[PDB]
């Protein structure tokens, strides 16, 4: 739906690293380096961005 | 006197169900073992 | 002219063109479309 706050597994906040991740994939950065620049060394936290689906974009089209 | 079971009601669970509810055959009743002419046509 | 070992990404191009055009439920959009035609 949207990026969750706080990776469930270890507890670390990861919910603000999304709009700094779509904007960071405009440049030439690989995904394997797009996350370490954000400071995510566990593979608990990295599965919450690398394999995320942000579906809130497709729901911001419909009328209220 | 009719052949019922046509026009089922559609699943909404997964969207992989909604797909594979639409790509579906139905035998009319050995119709149960897996025949060799289902290479390429039907999922085994 | 001939692709020796580039075949892997080659065969997933010609399928991408397939499910663009036909898709997954065209078997009821050919059949029911031909019944009203």
């Amino acid at each position: 739906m949207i990026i969750p706050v706080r990776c469930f597994t270890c507890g670390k906040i990861v919910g603000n690293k999304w709009e700094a991740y779509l904007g960071l994939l405009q440049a030439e950065y690989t995904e394997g380096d797009a996350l370490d620049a954000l400071g995510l060394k566990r593979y608990c936290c990295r599965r919450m961005l690398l394999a995320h689906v942000d579906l809130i974009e497709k729901l911001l089209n419909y009328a209220p | 006197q009719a052949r019922a079971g046509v026009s089922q009601v559609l699943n909404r669970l997964t969207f992989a169900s909604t797909l594979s509810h639409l790509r579906r055959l139905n035998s009319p009743i050995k119709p149960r073992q897996l025949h060799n002419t289902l290479w390429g046509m039907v999922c085994p | 002219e001939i692709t020796p070992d580039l075949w892997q990404e080659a065969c997933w191009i010609v399928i991408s063109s397939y499910f663009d055009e036909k898709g997954l439920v065209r078997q009821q959009l050919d059949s029911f479309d031909e019944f009203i035609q």
Partner: protein, 262 residues
């Protein structure tokens, strides 16, 4: 028949990470400090949520979840508050709660992101984290298009982690002991393929220290990383006082069980 006399050596004290080494203790006391960090350290988080106007595409109990997990800056007023069930008032007084407020609507054309910088507190000390003044971009809650509005009050109780896990103060406490395997607490089937760890004193040739026929461990290598609510150092000081208080909730209470049998 008496206690043990430990030591502490610290190798790193950055702004969100404390890594140290405690010698001269048994293992069971050495679990029981990493087991208080992720469980029994009090902290402020949101616990009472009222939405007065919701029009986002997310249902009311899905934003009310995300307001729960937002960490809050709880450096000062944690000792200077009290819990809700030890209070005096009816429901919430300022001695035990912190009221927030959010009133954002989006009548602009462009897609507005409701972020952490729109929770406005009533007291200037518990601001939500990502407001301390590394760019540290804003924590997100909910996006909004044109014609949508959000409005809510919220309170912020003191609690700890044997409630809901939003009151976790820390990230992964990376406890670790005996990096060379000289106690043989685990048995490697093939000793040669293993990664030598972050603290092992070996060369490249051997891969296990030999056995210790009379040994039991010390040097429990803690690596306490904080989430960002507390400072990383004020966890450990507020956890040994959250364990010395609990063991002093026995010899009080044990005495009034023994001596009351007379």
């Amino acid at each position: 028949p008496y206690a043990n006399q430990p030591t502490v050596r610290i190798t790193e004290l950055t702004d969100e990470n404390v890594k140290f080494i405690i010698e001269n203790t048994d293992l069971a006391v050495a679990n029981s400090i990493r087991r208080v960090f992720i469980a029994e350290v009090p902290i402020i988080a949101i616990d009472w949520v009222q939405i007065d106007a919701n029009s986002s595409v997310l249902h009311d109990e899905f934003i009310a979840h995300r307001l729960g997990l937002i960490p809050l800056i709880s450096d000062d007023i944690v000792d200077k508050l009290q819990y809700s069930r030890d209070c005096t008032c009816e429901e919430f007084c300022p001695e035990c709660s912190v009221e927030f407020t959010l009133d954002v609507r989006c009548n602009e054309d462009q897609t507005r992101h409701v972020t952490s910088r729109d929770l406005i507190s009533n007291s200037p000390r518990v601001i939500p984290v990502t407001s301390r003044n590394v760019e540290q971009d804003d924590i997100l809650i909910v996006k909004l298009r044109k014609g949508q509005e959000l409005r809510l009050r919220a309170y912020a109780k003191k609690g700890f982690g044997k409630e809901h896990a939003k009151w976790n103060p820390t990230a992964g406490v990376a406890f670790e002991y005996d990096p060379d395997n000289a106690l043989r607490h685990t048995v490697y089937p093939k000793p040669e393929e293993w990664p030598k760890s972050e603290y092992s004193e070996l060369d490249e040739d051997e891969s296990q220290a030999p056995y210790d026929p009379n040994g039991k461990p010390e040097r429990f290598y803690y690596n306490v990383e904080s989430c960002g609510s507390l400072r990383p150092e004020t966890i450990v000081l507020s956890a040994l006082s959250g364990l010395k208080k609990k063991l002093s909730d026995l010899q009080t209470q044990l005495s009034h069980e023994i001596q009351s049998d007379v």
